[PDB]
Amino acid sequence: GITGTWYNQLGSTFIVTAGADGALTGTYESNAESRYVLTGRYDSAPATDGSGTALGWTVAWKNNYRNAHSATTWSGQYVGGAEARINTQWLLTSGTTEANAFKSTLVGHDTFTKV
Amino acid sequence: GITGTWYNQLGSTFIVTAGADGALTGTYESAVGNAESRYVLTGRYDSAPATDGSGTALGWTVAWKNNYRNAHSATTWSGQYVGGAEARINTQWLLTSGTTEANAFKSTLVGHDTFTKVKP
Amino acid sequence: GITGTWYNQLGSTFIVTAGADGALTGTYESNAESRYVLTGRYDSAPATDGSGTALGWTVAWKNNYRNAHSATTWSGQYVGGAEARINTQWLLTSGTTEANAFKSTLVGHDTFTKV
Amino acid sequence: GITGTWYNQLGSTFIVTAGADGALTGTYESNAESRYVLTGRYDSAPATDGSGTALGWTVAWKNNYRNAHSATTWSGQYVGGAEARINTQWLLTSGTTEANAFKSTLVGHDTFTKV
Numbered sequence: 001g002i003t004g005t006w007y008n009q010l011g012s013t014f015i016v017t018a019g020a021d022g023a024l025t026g027t028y029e030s031n032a033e034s035r036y037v038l039t040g041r042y043d044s045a046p047a048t049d050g051s052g053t054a055l056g057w058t059v060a061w062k063n064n065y066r067n068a069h070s071a072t073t074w075s076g077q078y079v080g081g082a083e084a085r086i087n088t089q090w091l092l093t094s095g096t097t098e099a100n101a102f103k104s105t106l107v108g109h110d111t112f113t114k115v
Numbered sequence: 116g117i118t119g120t121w122y123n124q125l126g127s128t129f130i131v132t133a134g135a136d137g138a139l140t141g142t143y144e145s146a147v148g149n150a151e152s153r154y155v156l157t158g159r160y161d162s163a164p165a166t167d168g169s170g171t172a173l174g175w176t177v178a179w180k181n182n183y184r185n186a187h188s189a190t191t192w193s194g195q196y197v198g199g200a201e202a203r204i205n206t207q208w209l210l211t212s213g214t215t216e217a218n219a220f221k222s223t224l225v226g227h228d229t230f231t232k233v234k235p
Numbered sequence: 236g237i238t239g240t241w242y243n244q245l246g247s248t249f250i251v252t253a254g255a256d257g258a259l260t261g262t263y264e265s266n267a268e269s270r271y272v273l274t275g276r277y278d279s280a281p282a283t284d285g286s287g288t289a290l291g292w293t294v295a296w297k298n299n300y301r302n303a304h305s306a307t308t309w310s311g312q313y314v315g316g317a318e319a320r321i322n323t324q325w326l327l328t329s330g331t332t333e334a335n336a337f338k339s340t341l342v343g344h345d346t347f348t349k350v
Numbered sequence: 351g352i353t354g355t356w357y358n359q360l361g362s363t364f365i366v367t368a369g370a371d372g373a374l375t376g377t378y379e380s381n382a383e384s385r386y387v388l389t390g391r392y393d394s395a396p397a398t399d400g401s402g403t404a405l406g407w408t409v410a411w412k413n414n415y416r417n418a419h420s421a422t423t424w425s426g427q428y429v430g431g432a433e434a435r436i437n438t439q440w441l442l443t444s445g446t447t448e449a450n451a452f453k454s455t456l457v458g459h460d461t462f463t464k465v
Contacts, residue, residue, distance in 0.1 A: 010452070022155065022178050022180060023157070024176075037136075037137065037159065038159075039138070039157045039158065039159060039176075040157065040176045041155065041156075041157060041176045041177060041178035041189060042178055042189065043178050043179075043180050043185065043187055043188070043189065043213065044178075044180060045180065045185055046187060046213050047187055047213060049215070050215045051187065051213040051214055051215055052213045052214060052215075052219075053213055054178065054179075054187055054188045054189040054211050054212060054213045055176075055178065055189055056176035056177075056178070056189040056190070056191040056209075056211070057176060057191075058157075058158045058159045058174035058175060058176060058191065058193075059159060059174075060137050060159035060160055060161050060162075060172065060173070060174070061161075062137060062161050062162065062163060067161065067163055069161055069164060069165050069169060069172055070161070070172045071159060071160065071161065071172040071173055071174040071193060072174070072193070073158075073174040073175075073176065073191035073192065073193040073209070074191065075176075075189060075190070075191040075209035075210070075211045075223065076211055076223075077211055077213055077214070077219075077222065079216070087219065088211075089209050089211070089223050089342060089343075089344075090209075091174075091191070091193035091207050091208075091209060091457065092193070092453075093172050093173075093174070093193045093194050093195055093206075093207070094172060094195075095161060095164055095165060095169040095170045095171055095172045095195055096169055096170060096195065097167070097168050097169055097170075098168075098170075098197065101170070101195075101205065102360070102458055103442070103456050103458075104170075104195065105193060105194075105207050105456060105457050105458065106453055106455060106456055106457070107324060107342070107441070107455050107456070107457040108324075108452050108453075108455060109324075109344050125337065147337055148337070148338070207457060207458075207459075209342070220245070220343055221327075221341055221343075223341060223342050223343065224337075224338055224340065224341060224342070225326070225340050225341070225342035225439060225457070226337055226340065226439075227439070227459045257387070257410050257412060258389065259408075272372070272391065273391075274373070274389045274390065274391060274408075275389060275408040275423075276387065276388075276389060276408045276409065276410035276421060277410055277421065278410055278412055278417065278419055278420070278421065278445060279410075279412060280412060280417055281419060281445055282419050282445055284447070285447045285448075286419065286445035286446050286447055287445050287446060287447075287451070288445060289410065289419055289420045289421040289443050289444060289445045290408075290410065290421055290443075291408035291409075291410070291421045291422070291423035291441075291443070292408060292423075293374075293389075293390045293391045293405075293406035293407060293408060293423065293425075294391065295372055295391035295392055295393055295394075295404065295405065295406070297372060297393055297394060297395060302393065302395055304393055304396060304397060304401065304404055305393070305404045306391060306392065306393065306404040306405055306406040306425060307406070307425070308406040308407075308408065308423035308424065308425040308441070309423065310421065310422070310423040310441035310442070310443040310455060311443050311455075312443055312444075312445055312446070312451075312454065314448070322451065323443075324441055324443070324455055325441075326406075326423070326425035326439055326440075326441060327425070328404050328405075328406070328425045328426050328427055328439070329404060329427075330393060330396055330397060330401040330402045330403055330404045330427055331401055331402060331427070332399075332400050332401050332402075333402070333429065336402075336427075336437065339427065340425065340426075340439055
């Protein structure tokens with residue numbers, strides 16, 4: 001159920017392939033200037049008790065056209081079914097000097113759907 | 116640089132290779148939790164950091180499943196590498212477990228890790 | 236604005252009083268055994284540009300009937316408007332031995348509405 | 351054991367009184383320009399098995415001299431002993447417009463000592 005195209009509410013889009021041995025590979029877009037490589041991992045043998053599938057992935061926001069000197073990680077779970085969704089929490093860290101490290105990391109949450 | 120063997124404050128080991136293309140590949144062995152042996156890791160880093168003394172942003176994921184066991188969970192580390200006298204990588208991390216919908220509210224642990232090239 | 240009775244996504248009720256110089260006082264429930272004291276602070280002089288009102292509160296999960304040996308803090312902002320809402324992120328810390336400190340804190344998010 | 355003056359390792363000072371009712375009251379200094387009111391809660395009946403004591407507190411960064419339109423919540427635990435410490439994770443939320451509301455919260459950590 002994970003392989004495919006996913007959308008959040010802010011428009012953004014991500015296309016992933018969930019390989020056989022837990023790999024997650026794909027791209028994240030918000031045009032070419034807006035596409036970034038993603039890579040992650042997921043639990044390739046989840047429970048069957050009704051639990052979701054744990055996964056995670058990272059995007060460093062540099063492509064051949066841009067560099068924000070930052071990286072986001074999303075940690076969450078795939079919830080299959082008719083309203084399949086991926087519920088995540090994320091951390092965005094920015095390259096900062098030591099003096100400003102205390103405010104280098106933003107936290108938030110995102111839900112992705114197939115629609 | 117980032118490539119090498121790193122240790123966190125708890126004795127966990129992170130062996131990583133920083134590719135040319137912003138890719139991070141390696142292995143992680145955790146000292147704590149529902150873990151055993153090495154786990155595959157993958158991530159990304161900024162391969163063209165700023166000059167001003169800023170650190171290098173990076174992140175990576177481990178799904179806690181190998182041939183020995185499966186914890187049904189995954190951890191993502193988000194942070195930055197700071198080179199120099201004592202090189203170090205400072206991170207914040209999110210550990211998400213597979214749960215049913217009713218317990219999704221308690222599925223995610225949050226913490227911070229410091230990695231260094233010398234074992235503590 | 237902030238003063239009154241609020242509800243989250245899950246059926247918990249939060250009754251607050253917002254005081255003239257930034258105190259937040261009240262109770263958090265989910266009967267009496269599920270009733271706990273909260274306290275916090277808010278920006279008593281927000282921006283007039285459209286931004287929300289920053290706030291936070293804490294609940295320790297001890298009352299006369301129960302003690303879970305833990306505390307939750309909510310960090311967020313009130314938004315006045317169509318549906319007045321409080322959007323938050325929370326941290327729940329459990330008292331642990333230092334061997335288990337790594338697993339002591341959960342993170343999540345909640346949205347409160349007067350409905 | 352919590353009542354007292356506490357220092358983090360970046361020049362900040364927390365003076366707190368822990369009340370018999372589970373209340374935390376005090377001052378956070380980062381000068382009188384730099385003094386802010388804090389309020390929180392803690393477990394007034396913790397375990398005596400070596401587990402720490404859960405607590406939290408909030409500072410809204412408004413005083414009579416300045417206003418950052420922001421608030422920090424600290425979630426953590428007190429650990430007694432020779433080298434007593436309070437280990438925390440915090441959330442700093444800023445007042446933002448609706449569209450910037452995703453970049454509104456910073457996450458970090460703090461350790462305080464009686465030094």
